[PDB]
Amino acid sequence: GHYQAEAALLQCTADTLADAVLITTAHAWQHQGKTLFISRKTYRIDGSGQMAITVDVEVASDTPHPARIGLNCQLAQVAERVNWLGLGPQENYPDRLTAACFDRWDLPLSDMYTPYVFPSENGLRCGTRELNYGPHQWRGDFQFNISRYSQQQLMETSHRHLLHAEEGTWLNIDGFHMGIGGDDSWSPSVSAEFQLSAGRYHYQLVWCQK
Amino acid sequence: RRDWENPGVTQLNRLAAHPPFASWRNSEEARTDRPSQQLRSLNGEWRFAWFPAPEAVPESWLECDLPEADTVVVPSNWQMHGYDAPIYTNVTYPITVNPPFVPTENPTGCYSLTFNVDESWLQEGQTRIIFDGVNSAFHLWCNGRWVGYGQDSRLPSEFDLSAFLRAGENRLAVMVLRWSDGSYLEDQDMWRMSGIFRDVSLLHKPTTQISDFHVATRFNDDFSRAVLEAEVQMCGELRDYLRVTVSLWQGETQVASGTAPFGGEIIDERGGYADRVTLRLNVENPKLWSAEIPNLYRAVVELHTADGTLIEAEACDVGFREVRIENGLLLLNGKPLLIRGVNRHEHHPLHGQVMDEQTMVQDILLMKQNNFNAVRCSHYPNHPLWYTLCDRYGLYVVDEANIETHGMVPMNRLTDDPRWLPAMSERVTRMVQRDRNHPSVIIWSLGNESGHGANHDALYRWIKSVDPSRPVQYEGGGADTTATDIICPMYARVDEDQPFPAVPKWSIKKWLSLPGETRPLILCEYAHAMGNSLGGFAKYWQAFRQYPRLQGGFVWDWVDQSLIKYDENGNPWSAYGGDFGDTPNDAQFCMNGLVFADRTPHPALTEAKHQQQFFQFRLSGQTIEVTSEYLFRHSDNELLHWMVALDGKPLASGEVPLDVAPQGKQLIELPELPQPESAGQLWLTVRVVQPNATAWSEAGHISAWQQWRLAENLSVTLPAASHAIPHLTTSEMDFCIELGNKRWQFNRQSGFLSQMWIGDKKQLLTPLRDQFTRAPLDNDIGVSEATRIDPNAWVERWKAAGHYQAEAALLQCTADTLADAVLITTAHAWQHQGKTLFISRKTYRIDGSGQMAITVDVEVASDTPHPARIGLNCQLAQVAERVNWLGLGPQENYPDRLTAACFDRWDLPLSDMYTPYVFPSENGLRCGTRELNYGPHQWRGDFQFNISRYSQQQLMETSHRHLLHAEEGTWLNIDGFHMGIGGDDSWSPSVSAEFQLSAGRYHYQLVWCQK
Ligand SMILES: [Mg+2]
Ligand SMILES: [Mg+2]
Ligand SMILES: [Mg+2]
Ligand code: NA
Ligand code: NA
Ligand code: NA
Ligand code: NA
Ligand code: NA
């Protein structure tokens, strides 16, 4: 039920601090009475307009390890360039990133999308400490992909030529991402060390206007 | 003549070696192995006098007792009696290296015994004396007359006293030298002692006697038939009336028998051996011997006349088994062995190197009880009783020649020298001549750490020639030389190569497939169990099971070589190198056992038992698949107990009989397990139980176990809101929170929770602070010393980086009032000489229910050596009797040594949460803990922890456990993360990468409250 899972709000509070506002949330993703994941976050907005997001996720040990653990949203903005400090410049995943180098990369949005004939998750960049797009800037230690195609459209389209740029820009920022595998393509091939099986994950982001 | 400084003279008038003799004069007593009237023990009280050198011994000593002498028990090592100090040195020889010379000041032990001898023994036959062990050389006199000389401290020296004895009173004079040229071949890493440390006895044999006998067993392809071949040799006068009968017995049933006059087959142009005969007995469907089922037969050898009159009889236990290497695999009775072995020195904390039956039996029982099936005689032939016990209890044995020249430079300086071949050959040949009839001995070893020399190749071939029934191995010179049938490295790692020049230690998986290599690989030594060790043990066994040609190894080692000393108050304590004034010495390095000197188990023993299990398990749905790793026996004394529990709370359980053929499988379908109401993790635990007692274990013995996480129900129910609200109070130096009868105090100058109150009672003796270090384990220290630092050792890297000196610098300490709680935020920076090592950011959240949630986020500079741990610590004021926790246990377990630990609810007395390693260090940790209870306290989360009356500081400042003193209150170390302990060896970094804290950023959270 990973693709059907519905977010159930368990808690949502707000507090005023001597120099910032604190939002606290807790969600439970379930499927037919089974709690798959539990996400606990805290958003801290300070006088500098920087939003600090802290995420702590629990994954039921008996549910298949998730493909990723992150956040996503559709940005209204559509910029021409994508600038980031991390592994690149080309697409790289946890179990396929040795060739990637850490540095400051800047590419046109279209290059952040890999035109695989058969559409699927693509364009991820790992070990990123800073990401810049339009007026936005995200800081931390995450993996990410950014394009005009939602994960949903990608999994519903059989050929790349049938894809259509959606409104705005879809951003997927992951604290963790499963390996892609490949020893063969007809049986599970993602090595254990690249499966998200820790049970509990933590990552934090800082969103602000570049 | 100074025979003790000449490798050319290793003995004088010594009789030829041979298998154990008893010279029974009654075939029935021989069959039953009862005592013999012809074999007397001379053990007991002897007269002893110590001298600084042989030239100091008075001539009168040869004639009569020295009044100054004392009466002491024999066998014994005179160091254990206090006459001089035992020396613990590893590689470096205890004497100046100047072969074949030894110090002029050579400690000399003068033993003497006045004893009676019956006239009957002198009226006929031959009376000989047997010294099973004299360390390291000695001269013998009987009634004032010189008899002989002998060397090699680990094999029996026999002399004919027929012409020296008188009817009645007799006196033996034995001058034992501590050092001799023989010492150059006895540089084993152990305490250097001396004296008559093994049994002494008198054996009476007829003039016409059985002088030697060899037993062999050959089989057909399916082992349904065997031929026992017994070669018997005699001495004395040969006559046609002489006969030899070899009978084979199974209990009181005679299964086979053969008789023949003397006279072997023609062997060359000059004929054959008139003084020998070979009997061949056919045995149908023989019961085979193995460590799994030690089936034994009794072979009785009778020297008699044609008319049936007995002259004398000898005998031995026979184990029908075949040992051979085929297609790169070591096979026993046609099946590939998986060696679950351990190296075992002959050591006793009180008696030194003197062995006794009780201790031997104790070791064997503990070994088999912990799933070991093999032992290596490191590094010399053992006390004769040892092989008899291994034959009967069932253990595979590697018999090793007493040859080790580790301190030479290069290591093969003597072993490659033809002038030392004579001395070396005697140590190999006399061992084979003595133990070749023991079924438990399956492999011969040429010795230990003596490099690789031409002498090794010569002796390797000699054995292959005289005894083709057993493979020969030797590790020296690279572990895969031309002198070994088995690739037998010591401390070669599983996946990591150690490309040393000339003698590299390749990853064992890689070693097997080197161009042209085809031999099986069995480590003669691996998993150095020194102190808190055995980290990574499971990695070896996963490899052993996956690779056919990786057939196991022998752990190093069985028991700590610690010695007992007494304090001013007469209280005993465990001592090691240097504690006897012995210098130079190698301190703690004599303690590398899985068990303490008194045979009390170290935590690591359980990890070994688990990884060495004979049953493997797999879970699929409701089905448990059991696979047997036994090669010969069926599981006819095994029962499977299963149990399902929710966070320590048992929900269901049952038992299913095990019926698995060797190498077979059995499927066990578990009944419908009910879904638990409460949230939490369901755990399945299975264990194999032996309903019936055995010769080595008690009824109910647990031989194997395994755990699996089943269904888990994440808690989505929010805690009932408390109407109470914590109240914050402020002052220049503190932030205090109050809720009911509970108070929390945060020092604003340090930024740490400095004190807590429950009913106005202090809870802390020391503030709650971050900790990134640990009292160094033996593996963290390696060979580093105060006067000889090893910059590569983990402890030295931590010290050099300032991890132990680092001071916490407060970067931020704020306080905020929330709607229903109080939030404290802190940030610290640990620095050393301007270098920021770590940064700790925390938040403490105290709610209306009195719970304190601590969130910690640590940054570790990528260029500082990875920290030993990442957690918090404090000294609690409370001192409770019990420690209750939901996590891995019950015994001490670390990240790289926790497979044996089980998840459940454990409750132990505080003292059991501390491991008494002779050399103090970090200890008692328990990982994967979700809840910890102590006194009124309760901590929840997912952490590792240790709790005791000893601070990490005291532990790293104390050299011996007996010098530790319980501090005030209780020290608690709660870690979000802890580094592995390692152990592949203890002289170089051995913690595998996956167990090093190198992520750079860590996060963990705790909840502290009152139970
Ligand atoms: Mg000599
Ligand atoms: Mg050595
Ligand atoms: Mg396990
Ligand atoms: Na697709
Ligand atoms: Na194997
Ligand atoms: Na040692
Ligand atoms: Na059974
Ligand atoms: Na210490």
mmCIF file of C-alpha atoms in Angstrom, chain A residues 26 51 60 107 119 146 197:
data_model
loop_
_atom_site.group_PDB
_atom_site.id
_atom_site.type_symbol
_atom_site.label_atom_id
_atom_site.label_comp_id
_atom_site.label_asym_id
_atom_site.label_seq_id
_atom_site.Cartn_x
_atom_site.Cartn_y
_atom_site.Cartn_z
ATOM 1 C CA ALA A 26 3.060 14.276 13.267
ATOM 2 C CA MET A 51 12.841 27.932 7.765
ATOM 3 C CA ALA A 60 7.457 -0.445 10.222
ATOM 4 C CA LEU A 107 22.926 23.388 -15.394
ATOM 5 C CA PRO A 119 9.913 6.949 -17.901
ATOM 6 C CA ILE A 146 13.921 18.587 -9.961
ATOM 7 C CA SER A 197 16.040 -0.772 6.408
#
